[PDB]
Design a protein around this nucleic acid. Sequence first.
RNA 1: AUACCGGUAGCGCAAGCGAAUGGUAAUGGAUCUAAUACAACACAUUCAGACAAUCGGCGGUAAGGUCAAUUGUCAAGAGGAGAACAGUCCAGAGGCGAGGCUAAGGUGCCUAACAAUU
RNA 2: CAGCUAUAAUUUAGCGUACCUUUUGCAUUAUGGGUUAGCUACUCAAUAGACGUGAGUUAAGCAGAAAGCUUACUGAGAUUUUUUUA
Lengths: 96, 110, 438, 167, 98, 204, 97, 129
Amino acid sequence: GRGMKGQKSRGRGLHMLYDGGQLGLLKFPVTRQRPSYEVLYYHLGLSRVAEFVQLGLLDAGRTITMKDLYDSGCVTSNIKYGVLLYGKARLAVPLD
Amino acid sequence: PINRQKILQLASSFRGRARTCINIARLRVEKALQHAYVGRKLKKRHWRSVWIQRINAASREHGMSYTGLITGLKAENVALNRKVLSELAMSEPFSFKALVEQVRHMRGLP
Amino acid sequence: LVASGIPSPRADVALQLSTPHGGHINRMINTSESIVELDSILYRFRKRLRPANIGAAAMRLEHLNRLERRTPYALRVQRVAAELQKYVATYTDRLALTQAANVLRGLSAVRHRLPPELVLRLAAGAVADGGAALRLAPDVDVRDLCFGLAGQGFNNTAFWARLCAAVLPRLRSFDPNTLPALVTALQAAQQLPAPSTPQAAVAAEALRLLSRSETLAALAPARLADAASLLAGLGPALGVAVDARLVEAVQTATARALPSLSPNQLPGLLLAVAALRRAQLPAALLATALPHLSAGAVTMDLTAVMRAARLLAPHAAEPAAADTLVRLARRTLLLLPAPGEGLVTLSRVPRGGQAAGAVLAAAAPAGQLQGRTAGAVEGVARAFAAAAPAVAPQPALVGELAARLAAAGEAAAARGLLDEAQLASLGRSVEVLAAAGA
Amino acid sequence: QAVKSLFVTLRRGFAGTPWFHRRVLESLGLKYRHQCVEKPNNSSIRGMLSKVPHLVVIETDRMRYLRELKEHYQQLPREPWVLHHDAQPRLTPFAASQLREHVEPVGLEGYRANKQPPLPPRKYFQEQSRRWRAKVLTERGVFSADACREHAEAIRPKSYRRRTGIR
Amino acid sequence: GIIWHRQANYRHARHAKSASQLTRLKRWKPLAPAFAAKLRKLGFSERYWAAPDPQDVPGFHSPRGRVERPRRSAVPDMDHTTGEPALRQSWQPPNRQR
Amino acid sequence: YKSNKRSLKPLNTAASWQAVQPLLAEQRQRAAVEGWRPRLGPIVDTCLPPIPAVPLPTECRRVGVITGQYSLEPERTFAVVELAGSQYKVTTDDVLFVNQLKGVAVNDVVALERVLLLGSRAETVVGRPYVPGGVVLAAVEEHFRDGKVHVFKKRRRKRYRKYQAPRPHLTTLRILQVRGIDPAPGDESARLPELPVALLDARY
Amino acid sequence: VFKTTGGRSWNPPSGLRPLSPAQRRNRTKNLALTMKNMSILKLAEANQPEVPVRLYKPLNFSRMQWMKKKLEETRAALGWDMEARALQEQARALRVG
Amino acid sequence: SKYGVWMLESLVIKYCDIGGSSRGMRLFLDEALPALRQQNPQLGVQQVLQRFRHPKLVAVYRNGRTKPVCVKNLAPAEIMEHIGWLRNSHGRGQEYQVVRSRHLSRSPSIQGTWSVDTFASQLERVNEA
RNA sequence: AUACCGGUAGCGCAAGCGAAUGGUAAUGGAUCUAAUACAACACAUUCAGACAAUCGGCGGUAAGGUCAAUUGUCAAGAGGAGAACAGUCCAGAGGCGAGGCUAAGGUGCCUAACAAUU
RNA sequence: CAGCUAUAAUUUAGCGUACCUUUUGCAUUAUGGGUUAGCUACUCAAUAGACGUGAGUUAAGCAGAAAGCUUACUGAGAUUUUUUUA
Ligand SMILES: [Mg+2]
Ligand SMILES: [Mg+2]
Ligand SMILES: [Mg+2]
Ligand SMILES: [Mg+2]
Ligand SMILES: [Mg+2]
Ligand SMILES: [Mg+2]
Ligand SMILES: [Mg+2]
Ligand SMILES: [Mg+2]
Ligand SMILES: [Mg+2]
Ligand SMILES: [Mg+2]
Ligand SMILES: [Mg+2]
Ligand SMILES: [Mg+2]
Ligand SMILES: [Mg+2]
Ligand SMILES: [Mg+2]
């Protein structure tokens, strides 16, 4: 399945990203902008917090802390640096 | 490619080292089967030509050609093909003579 | 701009999609502006869908099906509905009231009925407590849940009792235009009997909320049409009465909410106020709603031109009523197939989003003969036999109208969509129209 | 006498034909030689046919009806001719073999009559028996009952036939 | 899963270019499908232009460093004997090894 | 235009026309409320049926089943019968190997009614299509696969070879009698025992 | 064709060999068939009936297999009330029959 | 069958009790061989048992010929079509192939073969002109 | 119910006229579509071409020279004809048959087939 | 190129320019092989992509794990429902 007498016929001598000599992937600018922090934070939506409150997993009369969110599986990861809340959801109950 | 016992027993009746040595007999048997394909295809042409020669000879004995007899028999809706007409030419010459004189009669009415 | 013929990325969609936040599949669903675009999004992430994505997909399928004017029984809509039904069967006890209400409303408004044991599971999961699901969910979730369970059959009358017992203390904190959907959902099932009692109690308290002033002037337009219909249909049976305060408020707010109804909603509201005054069409209200009825008759479906023709049936001698009725006559002539299209061609119908089913509604308007329009050609025939002297100035028009009414009646009787009583009434109306036509 | 349809038959092939004539012949619905299709009589079909008049044989439906009637009446059965007009040479050894195989009744007795000695063992079974004997002489010894019995059966003569074919 | 990059021909020599050309070159464009397929198969999954530092997050700071030293990184790497097999056609044997 | 790449212009043209279609329908409907080619019934074909000639089609009739051993004395009459795909001049006590006949079984007696010529020493009935009343009775003897044919195809210097070895399916027919024409003097057939058969159909 | 030199014998040493009467007979037969084709085309253009004939064609195999696949994926994607709804109008059709 | 005599006197069937190649053969014996015995009353079907060997199908013919066929891993339909080929034949093998004119007869030439003497009297009148 | 685009061949003393095939869009096809169209789905191969006919540059209106355009074949294609024959003409080989009809080419003998018209 | 097809059946007729590799093109007077037997070339690990077949879904996998690590989810309030009618 290799064809006739090329360099592909010899086997393991040419990298997949070599394109002939025009280094096209080396013609684009390099950006060193580090993104802001909060991309290392866990992102949790108010919609998931409200969904867990309607399911009955979260107390909704007591305070809902990060420990309560971690134990009920509302945060589906290990919280390394913290939890960022983003939202715009409709809530019918008061929540601390 | 082809089983080695099959190649040996196909080359059984060859001559020389092409009978017993396996890798000479392999090429010889492959060429023999390529010959067999063309020979099978040429059987039909050879025997049709042989039949047409026999019809032409038996028709020219009675003064008619092959063309006249075939055209007259097809014009009278007689569906005898070349094989049975050649067999009638060889083995029933009186039947073939009757056919030739009848075809002369109806394609000689004016 | 990739390759000069591929659309350049939009500004607000790229600003919404490029977030550090999660929620990418739901944002891709919400920016899908047509049907197999949504289906390709569901295909790309089919090993990645969670209950929130299923609720968003059902709601978006509902909105995109209503956004075009194509039927919900199209094969694309039914394939997306069955694909979502697989995930609904997978997550049938994990769905919260938001997501269960989302999938129920989305699959009922595209008229895809779930298996009834799945509906039973999905409602018993809503009430598998001391009603605590219905007290943490907002009013829109209760409205969508009631609308979804009014479809899918499920006239259980024991589930509805505990739902109405859960929603009755919370009902006066609801926003005042979700109440007609609750009353319509209770009426749509076999609840509200004598054509159990907490259902009638919450319907009565909802209609008491809807009947008052200072809120009836604050409903959105096209919610006042359904509220007026529900009041005129259920006033003397259970709730409020004849009194002129309500009728004055309805007429006053109807005079303000006229331009914001689509033309399929105007004759329902005007027949609603006509039924309200019988528990008619008063002066100087018809003269300002009738230019809207003539300007909305260019894009108006056949049951809506029934309702407008029945509305304009009891008076035809007025010239404004007369040329409004001949405008409805030309509209009914337009969207009903000829007995023998030419407006637009079928090869150029859009597969896109905006009003592609409206283009398919022209370009051989046959094939839109469902059962609703099958009975509705009989209704339009009766309504135009009632309105004699408005169209009878045009002889060839009413003759061709009778020809198309008879042709559609014969075709839909051949399809098995009519019976002998409707056929006899259709025959009486078409012979009246054909006798008037010569 | 109105030409309702046309009957189009390829008389040429596809090889050597330019690709645009080939595409016109594809869109006429012709794939093989001697294949006749019935085409309507409108300006589209006539344009396709006037692009390729040297590759096809066009004929009217009336023309084809008259031809099919003519050859149908010609192929109808007629009365037979009755013509009045009023020692086999030699057969080869191979002809005698073939008639002995198929024509005269020679193989008509039972199996116990006309049975033959068996053919000698084919080379596969000889190799299998040779492998068994090598196994026996290895793991059981020369002086075993199996080795001695195999030698005793080898020494006795056997009644066989001769192979005639190549297998 | 689309691989994006900034447009080239914008770093310098901007005086010799029109206003529309400079506005056009500020935009980003996706990679061509063939190159993107090779990078995706090679295993390229970089979600950011540069890695966000685990420090600089509030509550997660160095015990003794006031912050840290950044170390700006360079981008040249091409040799036919040792670095970047992707940027060479074949492998060159070394120069006599002393 | 030298780019050897498919243009997106047909997609752009189709998009533009489909985009304007809802406006065209709405405005045309608004003018139709506020204010092309005739086609024929689709016929299957335009040539009326020619009523095809029925031949004496029964090449094999399955007249009867042979019960027991029989014998066939040779006769001085012959016939030419059209069978499988060819025609064979045939006599009584004759063996024909023909392409497998379907619907016939071993020991069955079949009637070959496609007789093209019937002949005796004295007269020959030459038959335009077929001779009426001419029938040849044949006994099916075998349904056997013939000898293997080695079909090998090879192209030199190209790595292409293909070998298959089919065995043809054939049927042995023993001819029992030729009917229709009679022997020229009827000199002698010895009146041999007449072939014991079931005769599930007969014509005599 | 039309080559005399160049070491490859496409012709005899004389640059062609002209048409035998068999070749001319074949070209005459083919030209006669072409002339009858275009004469028949002129006659069919001059005798075409108004509202011309449409012949029955089946669906091609691609539309046929595509639409059988589409119909089989309607059957899996039907709602629960659908076959009863179809059966109701099926009964109602033959009550009027 | 040659001259009415059925020509296949005996059929021998060998199989195995435990072998997996004899699944089809055991199914053929259990469900299909009574039908073969009822439909072929002239036949004689033996049943031999070889506890470690592949299934075989030995056909014994009335001209003394014998033909062994191996039927390993075959379904009862394929065994039935093998016996259909064995029963309807005289047992000729892969190597025989018959005369290519497909015709074989004693006495070809009624009226005599054409010779030099058949039309001798006519050809001298032909040469007379 | 058709519309725009082009400045060649030819012609003219020039300015300028100006085809045929052609491109593009709309409309109509119960004409074709055992398939087509697309794919940021995946796996390749190829990136040395040759000749024949029709129109050309450079050559000698030389070269199975080299380089353009259109078409075909070979490449990767057997069969029949051309005596033999990569590229010409006919014709696209699943297999078997001692069936029939034809194409290119033939119809004195080798070598199948009319002293047909003779 | 030493065979093929033959009812040719003590002997004839017809057909038939080996294989491989490399080439635009080889019977080629281009490469290779005296024959026979034995040995002789797309393997394995880690990682990445895709497809086929699944598992789990209380998101998945690794793990002894309520450590931990790697992938995956987290949003909008969008009029729609009974074959027509009081
Ligand atoms: Mg030969
Ligand atoms: Mg032939
Ligand atoms: Mg050609
Ligand atoms: Mg065993
Ligand atoms: Mg010029
Ligand atoms: Mg070319
Ligand atoms: Mg080719
Ligand atoms: Mg060739
Ligand atoms: Mg040749
Ligand atoms: Mg040969
Ligand atoms: Mg080599
Ligand atoms: Mg050497
Ligand atoms: Mg070896
Ligand atoms: Mg633990």
